[PDB]
Structures are given as C-alpha cells and as structure tokens.
Amino acid sequence: LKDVNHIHPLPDFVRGGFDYVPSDIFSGKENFEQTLRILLERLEFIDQKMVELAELRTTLNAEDAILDEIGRQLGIYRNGLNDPEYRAVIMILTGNNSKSGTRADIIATLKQLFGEDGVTTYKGYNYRLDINIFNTCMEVTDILPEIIDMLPLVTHLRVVENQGY
Amino acid sequence: NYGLTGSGFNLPPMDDLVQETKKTFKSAFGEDFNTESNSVADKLIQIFNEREYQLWLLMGSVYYAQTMQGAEGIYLDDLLGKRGIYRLGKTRSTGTVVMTIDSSVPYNMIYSAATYTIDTDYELSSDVQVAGNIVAQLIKGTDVGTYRLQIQNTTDQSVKTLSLNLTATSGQPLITFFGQIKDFIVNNTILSNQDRIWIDSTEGALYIGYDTNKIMIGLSSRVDFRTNPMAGTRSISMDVRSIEPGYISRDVHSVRSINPTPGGFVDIDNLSAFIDGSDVESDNEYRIRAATSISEGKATRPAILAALLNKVEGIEKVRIFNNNTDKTNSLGIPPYRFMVVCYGGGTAEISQVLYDTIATSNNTYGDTFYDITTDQVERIWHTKAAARQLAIRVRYRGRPLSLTEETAIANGLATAVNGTMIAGTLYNVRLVGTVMSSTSPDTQVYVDIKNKGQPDSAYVNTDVTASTTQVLSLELEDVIFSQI
Amino acid sequence: ENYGLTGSGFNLPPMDDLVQETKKTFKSAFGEDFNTESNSVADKLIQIFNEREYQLWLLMGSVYYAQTMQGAEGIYLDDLLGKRGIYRLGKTRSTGTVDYELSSDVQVDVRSIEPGYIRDVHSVFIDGSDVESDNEYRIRAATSISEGKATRPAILAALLNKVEGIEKVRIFNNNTDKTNSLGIPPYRFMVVCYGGGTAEISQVLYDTIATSNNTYGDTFYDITTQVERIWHTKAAARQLAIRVRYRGRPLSLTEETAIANGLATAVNGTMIAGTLYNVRLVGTVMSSTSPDRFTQVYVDIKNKGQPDSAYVNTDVTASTTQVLSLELEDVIFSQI
Amino acid sequence: TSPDTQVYVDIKNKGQPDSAYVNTDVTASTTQVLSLELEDVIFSQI
Amino acid sequence: DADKAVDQIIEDSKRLHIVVNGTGTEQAVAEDGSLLPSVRKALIDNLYFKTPPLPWRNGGSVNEFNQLYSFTDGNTTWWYAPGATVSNPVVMRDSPINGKFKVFLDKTNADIYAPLNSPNFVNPRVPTPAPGDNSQSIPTTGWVQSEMEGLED
Amino acid sequence: DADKAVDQIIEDSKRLHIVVNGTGTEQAVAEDGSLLPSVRKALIDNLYFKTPPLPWRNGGSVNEFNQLYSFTDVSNTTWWYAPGATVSNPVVMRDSPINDGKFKVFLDKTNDIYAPLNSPNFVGNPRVPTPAPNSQSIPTTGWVQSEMEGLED
Amino acid sequence: IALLSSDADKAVDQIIEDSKRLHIVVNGTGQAVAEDGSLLPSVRKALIDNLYFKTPPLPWRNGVNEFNQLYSFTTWWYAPFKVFLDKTNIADIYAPLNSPNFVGNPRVPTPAPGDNSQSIPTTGWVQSEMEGLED
C-alpha cells in the first residue's frame, strides 16, 4: 500500500510552507508572495537533485562517466568495453560469486542477456556442452571471456549465434 | 557539528538552525533588529527554515543508502547485488494429495489435468493415471473364486504373476491367503514395507499402508499392483499446485474437497504440509537468506551425498563410483560417466534431486532412467541395489534361553542391515560382540552365516562381502538357536 | 542544469554565481529600477539566505567525495569496504612453538597471553599486528570472496581463505581432446601454488571441486570419506635484481627508498609464470614520485649472482614453475 | 587510463610528411612556444 | 528506418513550439525553404490592438506586444513594440524615435519614407554594381575604390 | 509484435510532418477519415483574406466575418467587414455601411516595400539622374567614370 | 533497439500542449498563456479589443475630445490633426526600396574617408577622393 523507498521528490513542496502563512494576512498582496516564492523555488531545484545524487549512483542507471568508479571498486576495469555491455560484464562477474555451474544455474545467468526464448543449451556425453543464441542485442566476442568463467573446470564448449530460430 | 563528522552522519533539530540564522540576521542589522513573533522578518525566516530541515533529513537518508545497514527497497538490491543474491518473486504452492477410489474404477482410466480443481485455488499438477500410482490398499470381508495378482518389480522391470483360489470366504484359509499375498508383495519392493502391512484376524481384513491404529500412512513409494477381481478400495497419490502465484498455505489434514466429483470418488486428504507459496520477497527474509548462504553447497561429491539423504522420503543408503580414464575399467562403466547407487528412493522423486550435479558432468549411467523437463528435456540414469538375504545360526553353551528372550538377540542383529554397498563386511567378531551385549551379562558362543536356501553345509565363519550392486539383508524369522 | 552529478563528474557552484541569478530572477519580478547594490537592505537579505543555501551544495559535494575510493579516510573508509562484506582486523596475537601460554593440551602449541603487540628471539613467534592500517587494509580488499564451487574463481577464492600460509596461486586449463602445449592430459586441469601445506590444500580442494577428479600435477595425496587422491605443484624458484639509470636532479636518499619499495610491489604482484614489461616498470617510477624530476630513465634486470654484463632491458617472463621475487640489497641507482 | 604492453610516441610539426616522425625531444625556438590541438592526435594498434 | 521518423517528430515538435510561442518580432523556419510566422506576428501582422491608447512615460517599461502608447511632443503618434513580453519587457525611454518601438500607420504617417523626388537620407546602402558599368545605376563606396584601383597601377 | 506499434508510429510521424509543413494548405487524413488542417490553414483566420472585396450591394448578405467588401460613396472608396457575421446569422446587406454599425472600415498595412528615410538597405538596381560633373548629390556609375575618364590622361 | 524513444516523450508531450494552445486560441471565446507567461487572445476575443472608429463622420469646424470619432471636410479627419481618407495613392510618391528610380536632387550623408564598403558615396566625396591619387 506504500512504497518502502522513501527517497522521492517531496510532493507539492511549493504549496507547503505557504500553508504556514498565519491567517491569510499577506495572501492576495502580490508583493510578499513573490518574494517568498522566489526564495522557496530555489530549494525546489536542490531538493530535486538530491534524488539523482542517489538514484543515478545505482549500477542499473549509472552512466559510463561514473560507472567506471563502481567497476573500479570491484576490480572490473573498462578495458575496451563500451557502456551498454560494460554494464553486462559487471553484473555477470558479480553474480558468479554465488554460483555452482549447474545446468539449471547456467540457464539462469544466460537468461538476463538474451530475453526469455533467446538462448538454449544442448548437452553431450563426454563433457560436451553447447550454447545457442537467437536474439542477441550486444556483440558477443567481448562478452565471451566471462561466459567461460562460470562453467565447470572441465567443460568442453561450443558457441553458435544466429538471429531467430 | 551536525553535518559530516568523523563518526558518520548526524541530524540537526529545528531550533539550532533557527537560532543560527537569527544570529546571522542580528549581525546583519545590529543588535537592535527584532526577530521574535511580531517581526515580518521572523515570519519569513521561520517559514523559510523548516524546508531545509526536510533537505537535511533527506540528505541524511541518502548517505546510509550505500551501507550494510540502512539500505531499503531498490537500493538494497544494489548492495547485495554485488554478492550475487536477488529477491524472489511470486511463487506457487506445491504439494501432493491422495484420494480413495471405489472398487469399480478401472486401472487404465486417466484423469484429465485441465478438468478438475481440488479446491478454490488448487488444480492438478499434470495428467495422472490410476495405474502405477497406488500408495495404499484396504481389503475386507466381501471378496469364492480364482484370483490373479500382478506387480512390477522395483529393481528389475519384469512383471510377476501369482495364482490363488479363495476356496473359503473366512477363517484359516482366508488367513493363509492373506499371508500368501503378504509374502508375495514383501519379496519385491523393500523390506520396510512389511512393517506396514498386517492382518487383523479378529475382523478378517487386510491393511496395506496403514499403522496399528488404522491410519493410512502409505507404503514406501508409489507402485503398480492389480487383482483381476478388483476387490477392496484403492488409494492413489496426486501432485497438486496452486492456480495463481501468491501466498497460500495448507496443513497436514486440510484438503477436503474436489469441485467436479469424479465417479467412484470416496475421500481426499493431505499427508504432509504443503510448501506454501509466497508473495513478493520482503527485505527481512532477503537479509536472512543472504546471511545463511554458507551452507548452500552444490555440485560437489560431499554436497551431492548430503543432498540426497535430506531430499527423499527414503534413500536409506547411497554410494558413488568414478571412472574417468579413457576406458571402461574393471567395473562395467562407460569411459567418462559417474555411477550412483541408492536404496529405497523411488525413481522420479530422486531423479529431480540429481539436478545438483555439476553442469557438463555426464554422469547418466545405471539400469533405470527417467526424463526431466528443464524447455528442453534430458534423461538421467541410476541403479538400485539388489538385496541379498542371509541365514544366521547361533550356537552356545549355557543355560537354555527362554521364549521371548531371544527377541533382544534377534533385533540385536539388526546391525547386519547397516552394511554399506560393496564395502560391507560382517566382521563376525562384531556380531559376537553384539549378541553378547543386548542381554544380561553371562560361556561359549559362535555365529554361522549362509545365503538363504542353501543346505546346512554352507554354514561358515569367514566374513562375507557384498557384490558390486548387492546389499546385505536379514529377516527376523531367519534366526535360529542351538544349545551345546 | 550544470550543477550536481552529471556523469562526467560532480560540479559545485561557487558562492558568487548563486547570488547572480537569484538577483536576476528577483529583479525580473520588479523591473530594472530596483536597488540591489552593495550594502542595500535588499542585498543584505539576499546574502543571508544564499549563504545558508550554499552550505547545502557543499554538504552534497562532501558526501559524494566521502564515498569515493580516492576520498575514503578513517571511518568512512571502513564503511565503503564494509559494503563489500569485509572488515578491518583487530589486536592480533603471536604464535610460537615448544607472557605466553600453551595453545592446547599436550602429551607424549604456544599462544600469547597478551592481546596484541609483543621474548621473541631464537633460543631464549609472530610479532606486531596491533591494528590493521588503511594502506594494507586497501591491499587486503584486493581479494575476492564467494560461496561458489566447481568454477575457476571459486577454487582461487577458497584457497586464499582456508589454506594457511598460501601466498599465490594459479590454474591452467586443458579442456580439449588432445594434450596441450604444456603436456596436460586431455580433459584435465592443473593447479600450481606457492607456499602452504600439502595434506591440507588437498582437503580444501576436495570440498570445492566437482564430483569428477580432474586434477593433475607433480605430487599427490590420498584422501577418503571411498578413497581418491588430488594433485598439485609448487613453483618458488626465482629471485631478481634491478638497476636504474636516470638523468637530472639526484634523488637524495629518502626518494630512492620511496622509488625502491614501490618497484618491489609491482614486481612481486606478478602472476605465476607471468611477464614483466619494461614500460610498466618505467611508469611506476614516474608515479611513485612527483613528475618533472627526470629527462631520461632506463631499468635493467638480471638474476642474483649474475655478472654485471648480464643486465638487460628487454621484457622478462618465467617458466611454469617459477615465481618472480625482488628484495633489498638491490635496485642500483645511478646518474648517467 | 585504467592500469594496463607496449607504447611509443612520435612527434612532428604539422603538415610534414609521415617520414618526419621521430622520438628525440623537441625544443622551442627563441620566440616560439609549443601548441597542440585535440584533432591532431592519431592512434595505431600493433 | 525508424530513427529518421523520430527525427522528423522531434524537429516538427521544436518548430511547432517556436511557432506557437514566437516573439512578435520573429518568424519560424519550415523544413522547406519557406519561413513560418508566429502567432504574435499573425495577430499584429494583419491588424490588431488594444483600443485605449496609453500615455508615453520616460519611466515606464512595456511588457505587452499589442498595445498602443501615445507619444507626444502636440504631435501625437501611437507606438508599439512586438518584441515586448512579461518575460522580456522594454523600457520607455525619453523618446520612442531612438528601437523595438514602431509607429502606428497613418496616411500621413508615409512622412518617414523617402519620397521619389530629391529625398534626404540619414547609412543607406545599395548592391555593388559590376565593374565598368557606365549606366545611371548607383555605385558603392567600395566599387569606387575597386575601380580606382586599376587606375593607380 | 512491437513491429505493429512501430508501423503505426511510422505513418503517424508522416501525418504530423505534413501537418506541420503543409505548405500553405494541406489536408492530412487521419485513420478515422476525418481531415486535419495544416498550421498555415489554421492561420487563415488571422490572415483576413483581402482578395478584391466583393462590391458593395443592397440586398444579399455577408456570411464571413473576416471577408471584406468594396463600397463607394457619392464622392471615396472604402472596404468594410461585419465582425458579427457568421453562418446561421448572416449580416443582411444594406444601402451603405456608414449607418450600419454591423460593418466597419478597414485599412492597408503594407507601407515593407518602401525605403525608410533612415539608413535604408536597397536591393536590385537603383538609379538617379547623372549629377552635374557634384558635392552632395548621389553620383552614378557613369558619372564617376566620366569624372575619372579625363584623369587617366 | 529503438529505445531512443526515451527522448521522444519530452517532445510529444510538448507538442500536445502546443496543440492545446492552438485550439484555445483559434476556437476560443470572447485566452491562452504561453510559456513566457504572456497572454494570447483568441480570435473571437481579439475582434473585440481592436481599434474601431465611429462610422458616421462629423462636419469640420476647426474647433476635439475623442480620438475615435471621424470628421468630414471639403476628406475624413480625426484627432490622435491627421487626415484619414484622402484620394491619393502612396506608391506613386514613395520610392520602393527595390529598384527605385529617383529624380531631382537625392542626397545622402557623406561617408568617412577611405571607406570600402557597400555604403553610398557622395559626389563631393569621390571628387575629394580623386585628388589623393592625382598627387
């Protein structure tokens, strides 16, 4: 019924405070109101930017100019990656820390990179595993090094990518 | 003082800000400036001041958003997202139910999955066939003629048949007929089943999958079994899930109805608490799950060993073998496939547990298989150990043991049922110790062991070892005593 | 719009500007003919409110800077790395061998009684370790921790946290049908470590590898739960020597220590069977001290004991079972 | 840049042919001063 | 593809914004070579005003694009300033004869445009004629120098 | 199936584009079949269509508020319009508007096409009588050459 | 892929308000507010506030209290005296700024010495200019 995240722009900030004019003594004088409005409306701008200072620092929306700072703390350097996929690698490596490389587990990680039906996985008798891609939205060669990391120590892997079925 | 300090972020009250700004105004226009109550400057400054209180509070809230404590909502995910843990969404309750069916319902009839609802919010998990899902049976009173009995072996896959005649409808002949049926069933499945079937001679009825108080507790696993004259009342086990995801819970004996009543229906009830569904995951249990992730082990030999023993309604014993060098090795195994041996774990329920295996580890060897949907569907393999019963003879010198005093000794040899697959060695010295332990203290004692059915010449003292896929077994009635 | 977080950084408006547009907009509501010059009553009022408002911008900038890695100091440093799930150490105690007390009962080891810094010489032990300072605290944060298993990062993470005395580790993989260039048998992988025990790492490895003993190495040690064995290797086996030549203003004596110790970190941090790049070594010297102190720089590398003629400037690597190491009594400074 | 094999720098006066690239340091004239424009930087992979 | 459709949308949006708002002394630029007038133009462009003339005042500031102000010296003329708004006011100076102010038209007013016969001007300009023209067209100051240049050499 | 939305967006953009840039007049067609007017069509209302006003009559009626009518007195010519004129309420015609306050006179805006006395910026080919071979008069191209023509020698 | 639309809305909404203002102005009743805060009257309102003269002219007497009542003499007159309806054209006496043909004695202010621009030179400026090269 209520949002748990209380960090939001204050609703109707301006009309508040004006509500504290005692008994409409000054209201309708058009000389005191403008003086008060001019000062209060400055806080509006500062109040608004208080959110982006917290909202924009999250990894989901962080821009490349500062996303590097988030990656730097985790040891994931930009190298030659671009912004749209640099976000992906950060997620992939971080998610690897609570993984076991099971068949059900592997499907889950690939799920975040190719939608619901964009990926499928065949399995083979002698350590063979196969990955199929149908709806890639980013160039895969630069993402490939991580795709190896979350697999068992002895996996034998093939990678094939195509658009659609 | 109240801003950023060496010990975190603080909060200023309103009055301190009011006094500070009033002092600033005083300095602006000398000590004579009025700033209390009646001043227009007072009404402007006080109104102006309260707003920055909100700004300070919001700023203080922002700072803690990036700390182990204070994170909430969306910001909480980023903090724990660094450690690869994500909230769980809407979930659907899962569980199993049983229902008794009239004697007349044919075996081959199959219930349509999409034409029934257990109760206001439960439906069949999938299609269900009566055959192969019998869990308990009750036979009583009204049943002369010729009867056929069928059963699928739980280790092999060969159907077995038995032929009998019910020359009498009561008395010792009926008792003997029931005993013959009991012997027929116990020779297959698992020995634990025999503990849960008996005959109430006082009423001349046979109970399958009940307790001494006449409560249906079910057999050790779903099976198939038939009688050409379809007598008594049969019970089956179904799998049930909720219609829409959310929060819902049911107790051990809650489910009580089905909206579209199928012909021949008798009753329906629960056996154990359902895995209740949940709403959107909250912060508290999110932190709790993040805290207890240490024990979450998978895809390792100790992990797979532990998981099986704690996720199956049975699985008394388990053992694994490895062959990973270019060849089939002595034991018949493909070059790069694991081997898993279990006891009393069923087929489908245990198969689902095997999804903890390391990805790309082929495993998949054994005598029995099953298919599981991931989406794609894949097949897994395993085997069930073939029990081998022993015959034990005890000889001693001393006072004659009295009837009902041999019960302690007989049950004392229950340790013989605790041998492990392959690596099971009796160590007859251990048996001598046990037989001399489960009794009052106090001359001579010996133990002889042989396979069932062999002549008396087969008795020996050397220890016995289980085969590759065999496991030791023993029955109470297969113990004898001799005085010397 | 040019104020606050902007992706390229954080921008803070100075005191003067905020007054400028405040007066401008304030003037817009009453026309040009409105006194706002110095010492005017209206101007005096404006200054008071803007100064109170200005602190808000300064506070925001401090909060952002306080939470960045570069600006982390004191307690604020603890919070930032605390977000990663690790915390600084405390008063640590010495360990000895048969003020002090026995660590456990003995029959046919040694633990210090005092809580911290500390009777520590041969034939009369780990000394010091009072408080774990920020510099090494930053270093200790370089590691990673996870609960995963059966994957390459998982193996590395577990070993560095459980195996006592472990200092470095690397893993080589041969996931193919035929033996690799390193002779690894097909469908097997090798683990090489430096330091640590032998019958303990095997225990740790067993709990974290998949249920398929694909290990291979020089030495083995059997374990049971059924019995199997685990393989591994040990490398050690190298110490280096360095000389540096430069032109300009001599570096006294203190700077050489600052230069010398700084180099030891970069060389030491190299991976097992890694490679050293002459360019990287030069870069460290340009960064371990203030720029604008040299016009030319060269570095020469040779193994200990080798003749002076053996100095070379080309990049150097190490074999599979070799680990690069550097120490003092090295780093010969000179002016060209 | 973020940390991390080989790097070289070549400098020449504007308009000269590519043969003018060198590594020796340059010195300003009596009344000349160095200058550089952002668009006058190129990169090559090796 | 679709990006170009979106580009069309956004350019159309900014054009429409300027056209609806405009500035009185402003006209928008269509995608083709033609230019689009603003509403503040079209209103005053054809003819429209607020009837009651208001007196001129040296200390006054105008903020309305469609009102007439009666200047006087009793030579009375009515003036307006299209580029006047509340957001961009204009100051009534000592006299309007000196920017954004324009005088209301009369068949007497005419009376500021150069008559065909012997008019006196106060920095007129004309296109530069081609060199060597001997006609009665009017030369420019540069044209004179451009031709005197050949003379010197 | 977002291709379906992208489709409709694609031609909605084109409809909007033609509406904004509908030359002087374009009639964009919506999916409902109704007809949307270009901006410049919507601007006819202010444009006050001064085609040659329909000659004044007695009898008949005026249907368009902004249309002008031509009338001549016994002596002058004037153009008249009845702002109250509307469909379903046409203004009945009359002998003369001078006592028909339904009607009101109209003037001409274009002075625009004439050079102001102050720093006009001429275009094309201005000409003046060749001044006397001087002082303050504007010289001609030939006048200058003729003046210099004797000097080269 | 086409999620650049995250910028399209800031224009789509804006054109919505612009269309709204268009509608109120064109189809209003005897106003509209721009982003600058200034007012735009609707046509059915603009038709009311504009200058209307009293249609019946009065005989002249050279006597004087209204700027909106006409007077007749012999031509129509009004007091802002200024005539209102004479019978002479304007295009016949006032030179168009494009391709004019002046007659008589046109004059301009003499430019500064040495100007090389598009301004107009004067006969007494060029004649002065000639002597410099003569020397």
B-chain residues within 8 Å CB-CB of C207?
A: 300, 302
C211 and B304: CB-CB below 8 Å?
A: yes
C-alpha G32/C-alpha G50 separation (Å) is 17
A46-64 exposure pattern, b = at least 16 Cβ within 10 A, e = fewer: bbebbeebbbbbbbeebeb
Mutate to test the interface with E, among F3, F8, F21, F147 (most CBs of E within 10 A): F21
Say which amino acid occupies C16.
Answer: D
B435: closest CA among B470, B387, B398?
Answer: B398
E126 and F122: CB-CB below 8 Å?
A: yes
C-alpha B71/C-alpha B64 separation (Å) is 7
Q: How far is D2 from chain C (nearest CA, A)?
A: 13
- Count chain E–chain G contacts defined by CB atoms under 8 A: 159
C-alpha B328/C-alpha B337 separation (Å) is 9
CB B412, CB B435: distance < 8 Å: yes
Give B313: exposed, middle or buried? Use CB within 10 Å, 0-12, 13-18, 19+: middle
C-alpha B197/C-alpha B219 separation (Å) is 9
A98: closest CA among A108, A88, A111?
Answer: A108
| C39 touching chain B per CB within 8 A | no
E-chain residues within 8 Å CB-CB of F142?
A: 133-136
C-alpha B188/C-alpha B184 separation (Å) is 7
| C150 touching chain B per CB within 8 A | yes
List the beta bridge partners of residue B119.
Answer: B122
Residue of C nearest to E59 (CA): C33
A-chain residues within 8 Å CB-CB of C84?
A: 73
CB B167, CB B266: distance < 8 Å: no
C-chain residues within 8 Å CB-CB of A46?
A: 53, 56-57
The separation between the first and the last C-alpha atoms of chain G, rounded to the nearest angstrom, is: 77
Residues 161-180 of C with CB under 8 A from A: 171, 173, 175-176
Could you identify the residue written with the tokens 């020597």? C241
Q: How far is A127 from chain B (nearest CA, A)?
A: 5
C-alpha B196/C-alpha B216 separation (Å) is 10
C-alpha C145/C-alpha C137 separation (Å) is 15
E107 and G51: CB-CB below 8 Å?
A: no
Hey, which chains touch E, using 3+ CB pairs under 8 Å?
C, F, G
Give B191: exposed, middle or buried? Use CB within 10 Å, 0-12, 13-18, 19+: middle
Q: How far is A24 from chain C (nearest CA, A)?
A: 22
| C178 touching chain B per CB within 8 A | no
Phi-psi region of B40 (alpha: psi -120 to 50; beta: other; left: phi over 0): alpha
B-chain residues within 8 Å CB-CB of A53?
A: 62
| A154 touching chain B per CB within 8 A | yes
What does the block give as tokens for B66?
Answer: 């990036």
CB C145, CB C157: distance < 8 Å: yes
| E91 touching chain C per CB within 8 A | yes
B300 and C51: CB-CB below 8 Å?
A: no
Residues 6-35 of D with CB under 8 A from C: 6-7, 25
Rounded to whole angstroms, the maximal C-alpha distance in chain B is 125
What does the block give as tokens for B135?
Answer: 């869990």
**DSSP letter assigned to residue C184:** P
G-chain residues within 8 Å CB-CB of E139?
A: 121
F-chain residues within 8 Å CB-CB of G101?
A: 126-128
Cross-chain CB nearest to F128 (options E16, E136, E148): E136
**DSSP letter assigned to residue B196:** T
| A100 touching chain D per CB within 8 A | no
A100 and C7: CB-CB below 8 Å?
A: no
Cross-chain CB nearest to G55 (options F101, F113, F148): F101
Residue C67: alpha-carbon gap to chain centroid: 19
C-alpha G81/C-alpha B31 separation (Å) is 65
Start-end of H helices in chain C: 15-28, 41-67, 74-82, 134-140, 152-162, 201-208, 254-268, 278-287
C-alpha E35/C-alpha E40 separation (Å) is 15
What is the 3-class SS of B131-191, one letter each residue?
CCCEEEEEEECCCCCEEEEEEECCCCCCEEEEEEECCCCCCHHHHHHHHHHHHHHHCCCCH
**DSSP letter assigned to residue B210:** B
F-chain residues within 8 Å CB-CB of G122?
A: 135-139
Whether chain F lies against chain B with 3 or more Cβ pairs closer than 8 A is no
C-alpha B383/C-alpha B317 separation (Å) is 12
List the beta bridge partners of residue B341.
Answer: B319, B383
Q: Mark out chain C residues that contact chain E at CB-CB < 8 A.
A: 28, 31-33
B72 and A57: CB-CB below 8 Å?
A: no
Hey, which chains touch G, using 3+ CB pairs under 8 Å?
E, F
| B286 touching chain A per CB within 8 A | no
Is residue B70 helix, strand or coil? coil
List the beta bridge partners of residue B56.
Answer: none
Mutate to test the interface with A, among D1, D2, D43, D45 (most CBs of A within 10 A): D2
**DSSP letter assigned to residue C293:** S
C175 and A155: CB-CB below 8 Å?
A: yes
Length of chain B as a residue count = 484
E114 and F111: CB-CB below 8 Å?
A: no
Hey, which chains touch A, using 3+ CB pairs under 8 Å?
B, C, D
A99 and B52: CB-CB below 8 Å?
A: no
C-alpha D39/C-alpha E92 separation (Å) is 50
Q: How far is E38 from chain F (nearest CA, A)?
A: 10
| A43 touching chain C per CB within 8 A | yes
- Whole-number Cα distances in Å, G79 to B476, D17, E71, F111, G83: 135, 81, 14, 21, 9
E-chain residues within 8 Å CB-CB of C33?
A: 59
Q: How far is F82 from chain E (nearest CA, A)?
A: 15
C-alpha F142/C-alpha E132 separation (Å) is 9
B324: closest CA among C151, C202, A154?
Answer: A154
Mutate to test the interface with B, among C68, C211, C222, C229 (most CBs of B within 10 A): C211
- Whole-number Cα distances in Å, B384 to B155, B322, B344, E32: 6, 17, 8, 84
Experimental method: cryo-EM
What is the 3-class SS of chain E, one letter each residue?
CCHHHHHHHHHHHHHHHHHHHCCCCCEEECCCCCEEECHHHHHHHHCCCEEEEEECCCCCEECCCCEEEEECCCCCEEEECCCCCCCCCEECCCCCCCCCCEECCCCCCCCCECECECCECCCCECCCCCCCCCCCECCCHHHHHHHHHHHHC
- Count chain B–chain C contacts defined by CB atoms under 8 A: 97
B21 and C52: CB-CB below 8 Å?
A: yes
What is the 3-class SS of B257-301, one letter each residue?
CCCCCCCCEEEEEECCCCECECCCCCHHHHHHHHHCHHHCCCCCH
Whether chain C lies against chain A with 3 or more Cβ pairs closer than 8 A is yes
Residue G115: alpha-carbon gap to chain centroid: 32
Report the relative pairing of strands C188-195 and C215-216 from DSSP bridges: parallel
Cross-chain CB nearest to F120 (options G2, G97, G123): G97
Length of chain C as a residue count = 336
C-alpha D45/C-alpha D28 separation (Å) is 30
| E59 touching chain C per CB within 8 A | yes
C-alpha B319/C-alpha B467 separation (Å) is 13
